[PDB]
Design an enzyme around this catalytic site. Structure first.
Site, PDB file in Angstrom:
ATOM      1  N   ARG A 133     -10.884  20.151   8.136  1.00  0.00           N
ATOM      2  CA  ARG A 133      -9.787  20.409   9.201  1.00  0.00           C
ATOM      3  C   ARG A 133      -9.893  21.875   9.684  1.00  0.00           C
ATOM      4  O   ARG A 133     -10.341  22.548   8.765  1.00  0.00           O
ATOM      5  CB  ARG A 133      -8.553  20.176   8.602  1.00  0.00           C
ATOM      6  CG  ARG A 133      -8.048  18.814   8.188  1.00  0.00           C
ATOM      7  CD  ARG A 133      -6.744  18.184   8.104  1.00  0.00           C
ATOM      8  NE  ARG A 133      -6.357  16.772   8.267  1.00  0.00           N
ATOM      9  CZ  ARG A 133      -6.267  16.600   9.700  1.00  0.00           C
ATOM     10  NH1 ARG A 133      -6.230  17.153  10.734  1.00  0.00           N
ATOM     11  NH2 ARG A 133      -6.040  15.263   9.835  1.00  0.00           N
ATOM     12  N   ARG A 159       0.965  -1.035  -0.039  1.00  0.00           N
ATOM     13  CA  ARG A 159      -0.118   0.000  -0.203  1.00  0.00           C
ATOM     14  C   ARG A 159       0.866   1.210   0.085  1.00  0.00           C
ATOM     15  O   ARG A 159       1.608   1.238   0.684  1.00  0.00           O
ATOM     16  CB  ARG A 159      -0.824   0.104   1.382  1.00  0.00           C
ATOM     17  CG  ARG A 159      -1.609   1.267   1.227  1.00  0.00           C
ATOM     18  CD  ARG A 159      -2.763   1.268   2.478  1.00  0.00           C
ATOM     19  NE  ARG A 159      -3.152   2.639   2.858  1.00  0.00           N
ATOM     20  CZ  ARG A 159      -2.745   3.287   3.822  1.00  0.00           C
ATOM     21  NH1 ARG A 159      -1.817   3.024   4.807  1.00  0.00           N
ATOM     22  NH2 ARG A 159      -3.431   4.472   4.219  1.00  0.00           N
ATOM     23  N   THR A 184      -7.147  -0.391   9.548  1.00  0.00           N
ATOM     24  CA  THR A 184      -7.073   0.674  10.602  1.00  0.00           C
ATOM     25  C   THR A 184      -7.303  -0.051  12.052  1.00  0.00           C
ATOM     26  O   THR A 184      -7.793  -0.989  12.226  1.00  0.00           O
ATOM     27  CB  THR A 184      -8.194   1.955  10.465  1.00  0.00           C
ATOM     28  OG1 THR A 184      -9.398   1.428  11.019  1.00  0.00           O
ATOM     29  CG2 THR A 184      -8.047   2.266   9.268  1.00  0.00           C
ATOM     30  N   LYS A 223     -13.451   2.977   0.415  1.00  0.00           N
ATOM     31  CA  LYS A 223     -13.023   2.893   1.823  1.00  0.00           C
ATOM     32  C   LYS A 223     -14.486   3.500   2.404  1.00  0.00           C
ATOM     33  O   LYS A 223     -14.836   4.631   2.026  1.00  0.00           O
ATOM     34  CB  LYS A 223     -11.687   3.818   2.227  1.00  0.00           C
ATOM     35  CG  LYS A 223     -10.550   3.176   1.570  1.00  0.00           C
ATOM     36  CD  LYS A 223      -9.334   4.282   1.656  1.00  0.00           C
ATOM     37  CE  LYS A 223      -9.033   4.559   2.970  1.00  0.00           C
ATOM     38  NZ  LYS A 223      -7.713   5.413   3.055  1.00  0.00           N
TER      39      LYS A 223
END
Lengths: 463, 463, 463, 463
Positions: free
Chosen positions: D73, D32, D278, D220
């Site tokens: 963010r 990855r 994760t 994802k």
């Protein structure tokens, strides 16, 4: 020992107490009285003789009254002489009862013969010996074409395949015979030529008006109309008699086997007793051994799932009645021996199916059932348990009637007043019966805190 | 249409090409030649007539030669007159072939009669008409007590229930008849009175010595010894004929049905063809319709799982041969219609069972099988597929022999040289056969990169 | 509502009657007293407060006493200062308790340290923080090679992976704590660091000597020896606590998940309660919500089949005790909701398995069980019934103990004297409980005419 | 060997050819490239190094490009200093990027912040560290009430649980990164923050415009909107990455486990690859061994049925990359070892399901599949076969991509031109692979006389 039950037609050669006792020894469970013949004193004596044997030996049997039923029959011929009918000739039936017959015309006993038939229908005479095709109907005459050569005698039966016949549900003689059945306390009435639900209801009402509301009605399915209406007939009846011989004359021959199999299957699902009858061991009227084919026919009916098998002439008038019963019982035991349980939503079915499954998983030789009207015992029998069913009842009529259900041993008891008392008494009677012994597992089924006829408890005990 | 195959005994009333063509139309699949009677010219003409009809109509049939077999028979009587034997009398059999019989003694054709019997054995004469109990054996005499009254005629068959009889596997006439079978290229030989494995081996060696190594041997199981040795007989044979009538005289009558059911079951598991024969529709020798009981007997044999059913006198000499075949076919189709697959460790069985399961899950009307000796086709048939089996072979003998297997349609083809070619050709022939149509799913079974007789490939195609 | 039960460690922030009532409101079922800390007055007060809350609210809860257990710990270091050990350095443990430690040597509390270890064994210090390999054992010294860098503090735990440690089953303090538990009438004792059958027996004999024969012993499985001896430990225990955190230090890390799964499955099969404990929601000691990983770990333990889950520091000393219990209950309800029954030879298991199946087939929301010591209720729970279990008992201790079994609601009753009385009472209590309503089906399980602890009756009733 | 496949994020400590070879030795299957960091020269060099190692060792691996994705963010604070927000205080977000933040207001990078939020919504900052409730939206301001105490730093991630966020499917940088991926011939693209079908389509159309039509897209799933739209996302994607850490911030914590389980199950049913990612072994970024909880979490993901597991920081930048991969492989092998097949209407699924069952019934260690785009191999893997899958393909991209599917060993071959040639070659390659030996059974699956991507043949061979 066998689980399948044996119905024996009793007649002159088997009516004595001595013969009846030997019949029971050999495997007879139910006595059939064929009211096609005999008068009331004759049938009453047979009932007396059986009950004498029952009380003397302590053995239990049931009594079934089989009605003559309504019929279509030809009538008389000139000089009483047979006549020869030729294929292709014209032949006429007349409803004029006063006519004496010959090679061209004969009278029939049924006034509705002209009404019920249609051009193109088939008329069969003398157990299908002679076939005819209706070509015309005029006034009181049914004109036909003879389809095959044959000799017509007097007073021969007539069949109308696929026709809905407006004969009454009961002949007048049948009505008096049913009163006799109520007077005598018979356990079953086998009702002839049942074609539709209303036929069963009439018989039900007639029995009720003479104190026979607890007598079970076994409907005899004999023709296509009865087959078409079978579901409603079964619903209104307590059981079914599959009359294979009559069906063989009334429907396409390749269908008879599947009519038998489906009727047996439906009776099983409905928790209602089924009898397979006629053309079982007929050759034993004259011979001391049956044919290979007869033995196979009987065994396949057992494998189909019948509760009982029936002897006719071979136990009533034949020369080897005891041999017939004995070989019947031998076939029963040999066939029952190799059958398996069938463990395929109501509370009663959930508990009874589970109780049979529990019995098999624990190698229980015996299932004990508390029953008032017999329904509980028949609900367990539905799953073909390996175990014998010991049915405890305070109801004498139920005790006699359960003699006809496959694999059921009835036992009349003094009333049980609680569920724990049922377990105590059933364990004792389980041992006394010789059907189970110390250390065996028995499964006990009953209704607790519910109205009679519902099963909601299953219980496992070691003797 | 039906899947069960019909064997018809051919005789004078059905031997013409015209009759044979009508027999095939009505459902005949296999011609049986009963070598109990007829000479070689007579049987050869019947073979010629059938093959003429086959090539003219393009229909396929198989030919089965049924041997007379070895026998025990009584012999002649004084003045050729029947004598009346009385229950309880003494009666003596002698192996002295020169003796002429009377009410006290008769000769038998088998020299080993004294050797093979024992005091206490039962001797049955004339298809069980007269029973006797051996009381003593001295020199060339078997002294007996007659058990039942009867009239003894000349030249009657003798049965010895439960006795191992040292008759040869083949009568001398049988040996010449088998050479005739090899000369004529018959597809099957039904070998009479098979009692032990070595009987089958002798027949195998005899056929091999005359170029008949590809002829399939159907062993006829007729007595208790054959039943006891059934497993080894089946292993050495290509198939089995259940001779119910003979078993009815040789074993306890209640056992015959289970001998039939178990022998059929074992043949199915062994992927070997089974024929149910004798006492099928015998009444149709004289009547144009069978009895209810006969129709039921035939149908239960189909439900048992037989590959084929057989007509005897009713197609060979009776008055209604075409009616018999037709109603047989009607029974077959009516019964096959309601049967289900049976989907219960070897590579061939894994692939064939899986292919049938795949076919059923995809509603495939047809399974196409590539086969050299027929084993592949019979391995699929074992699971009673709903789908018809189209068997492709380059082997003419295999194509004829597969005519006897349930639900198999054989097709002779030019050799296929690859697995992809098999799929291309099978799809085309699937459509040409009319057994499947555009859009239908077909499952195709064959052996890829393996020796003949192993099945290891299953393939699904849309037409 | 949830079926999985919640054990909460009670401490200063949760010991008041007010907090305890809210803990029960949020889903707490069992109070754990961690006797690693607190004196007898504190624990006795907590017991008193819970029983006050129970009597005021009528809610039922159980009390579990968790022993400290035997340990191996390092001792003190010079100036109380941490030392940094270097991978590859030499480091020595000594059983001389008088020695003050430094970067080269430290004392341990266990005299058998030299005896139980072997050259090549691994010594772990501080929850596996620092690994050491024994290179030599001499006198009271275990000489090791440090395997990894780490900081050694004072009084750190020591683990010996794969070693059988000869510590006593009970510390001296444990013995007094168990007597206090008997005096106080606790319902469960959780015994730390159970390694073998004899450890469980020793605790049993101590409890029996002080009137605690009815206290259930939950053995805590914490190391490889306990895993190796699990079957005999389970047999001797009343239940199991899976201490995942301790096992993570003692066995290969990839094995811990399957040790948990195997142990839970075996407890289920044995009808014995199992608790999943340690490293559950530890992050909530400081945070008002758990981590994704924590929530998933707990839910998978429920899916594995655990009876109960346990909170430790997060309910005893943490800042968010009520949040921890509440989210735990939410996880329980969310996970229980999607689990199914497991229906898979003794009479008890046959009847209990059948009762669950009957309940499911009839959509029964409730199974009513009569039980003395709780075995019957736990035998039903074994099959993970959709229905809630209402356990009727006359035994106060049993009523408390059943609070820990999954999906069981205990109810203390006046003794039932017959099976019919049990059905009457159970129906009433079924309705009173609010767990079923008029028209619902309930299945009732009990023993009739058998010694306590045998289940042989299943009964179906409509409310 | 393990069947579950391992994705390793490659970074500075694992990018050399030497490290990569050892990574493959330890169990790495897929590299990855996390394009959140690194420039094109660094990533291109890593791709080059892997392909060097592949060509030198003959090992096969795949390359997965993981996009950064769109984000919200916060921005900077006065003096770059953290500020402490107080539960209950007022705090305002502004879309004005020019604003410098403090304890009362901070800017966000997303202009649609005002549009997509509603009064009552929850705003989460810094992986859910700080929660806020929108009280008003005016102009470019979102006024909130702080729900909990926390310290706000600069440039922290923002989550909007249960909100549909109108961010573009691709950041501007993502578009260039995808072109680079097409230029480099990567095998997979992992698309971050997929919320709806149209997001997947947009990525597809970009790849198609630069020659990447054969690159598989792994979507994802990271928030509630993606969960709500999962079915349509899966349909449009080639595979799924379950991002547990992100979901833990976006949905109720008790739901995350079942979101993972549901998504894995659905991917299996769709024959599409799934990665669990994760919060796998994150603690090993600093430690040489994982936690008990981490190991259990990974193993339960395998038991759920994931095709592959993924390492992030622990293989890219951590101190123990090889230890992480090795223990991961150990967990994989330990967990795969105890999983069973799942055998449960299309032709492909009928044949593939049957082939797995045949393999298991015959103890076949290997299933050989001919495949062009990989669908056939993934259709067999759907049933979790005990056997390893050897996938023969002429397509280099397919060979790489199948490296990610559980239990698949791809092998690039010269095209097979017939079904028999496929059996010959597969047998040879079966032996050459060392996955089966002489005498082993292998099942071979392919399509005969059908367009690519259809499976209709299953074949059994002995090596």
């Amino acid at each position: 020992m066998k689980k399948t039950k044996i119905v024996c037609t009793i007649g002159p050669k088997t009516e004595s107490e001595e013969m009846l006792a030997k019949m029971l020894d050999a495997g007879m469970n139910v006595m059939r009285l064929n009211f096609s013949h005999g008068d009331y004193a004759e049938h009453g004596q047979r009932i007396q003789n059986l009950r004498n044997v029952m009380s003397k030996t302590g053995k239990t049997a049931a009594i079934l009254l089989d009605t003559k039923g309504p019929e279509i029959r030809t009538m008389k011929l000139e000089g009483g002489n047979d006549v020869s009918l030729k294929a292709g000739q014209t032949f006429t039936f007349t409803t004029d009862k006063s006519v004496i017959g010959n090679s061209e015309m004969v009278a029939v006993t049924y006034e509705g013969f002209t009404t019920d038939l249609s051009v193109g229908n088939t008329v069969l005479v003398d157990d299908g010996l002679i076939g005819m095709e209706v070509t015309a109907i005029e006034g009181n005459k049914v004109i036909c074409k003879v389809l095959n050569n044959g000799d017509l005698g007097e007073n021969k039966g007539v069949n109308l395949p696929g026709v809905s016949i407006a004969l009454p549900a009961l002949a007048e003689k049948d009505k008096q015979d049913l009163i006799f059945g109520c007077e005598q306390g018979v356990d079953f009435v086998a009702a002839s030529f049942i074609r539709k639900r209303s036929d069963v209801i009439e018989i039900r009402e007639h029995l009720k008006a003479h104190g026979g509301e607890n007598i079970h009605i076994i409907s005899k399915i004999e023709n296509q109309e009865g087959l078409n209406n079978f579901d409603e007939i079964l619903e209104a009846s307590d059981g079914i008699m599959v009359a294979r011989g009559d069906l063989g004359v009334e429907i396409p021959v390749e269908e008879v086997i599947f009519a038998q199999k489906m009727m047996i299957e439906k009776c099983i699902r409905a928790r209602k007793v089924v009898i397979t009858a006629t053309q079982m061991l007929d050759s034993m009227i004259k011979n001391p051994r049956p044919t290979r084919a007869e033995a196979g026919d009987v065994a396949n009916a057992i494998l189909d799932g019948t509760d009982a098998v029936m002897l006719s002439g071979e136990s009533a008038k034949g020369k080897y009645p005891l041999e017939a019963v004995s070989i019947m019982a031998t076939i029963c035991e040999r066939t029952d021996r190799v059958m398996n349980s069938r463990l395929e939503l109501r509370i009663t079915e959930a508990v009874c199916r589970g109780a049979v499954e529990t019995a098999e998983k624990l190698d229980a030789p015996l299932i004990v059932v508390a029953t008032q009207g017999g329904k509980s015992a028949r609900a367990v029998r539905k799953y073909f348990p390996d175990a014998t069913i010991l049915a405890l009842t305070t109801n004498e009529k139920t005790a006699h009637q359960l003699v006809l259900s496959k694999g059921v041993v009835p036992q009349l008891v003094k009333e049980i007043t609680s569920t724990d008392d049922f377990y105590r008494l059933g364990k004792e009677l389980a041992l006394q019966s010789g059907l189970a012994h110390k250390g065996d597992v028995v499964v006990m089924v009953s209704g607790a805190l519910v109205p009679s006829g519902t099963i909601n408890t299953a219980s496992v005990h070691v003797l």
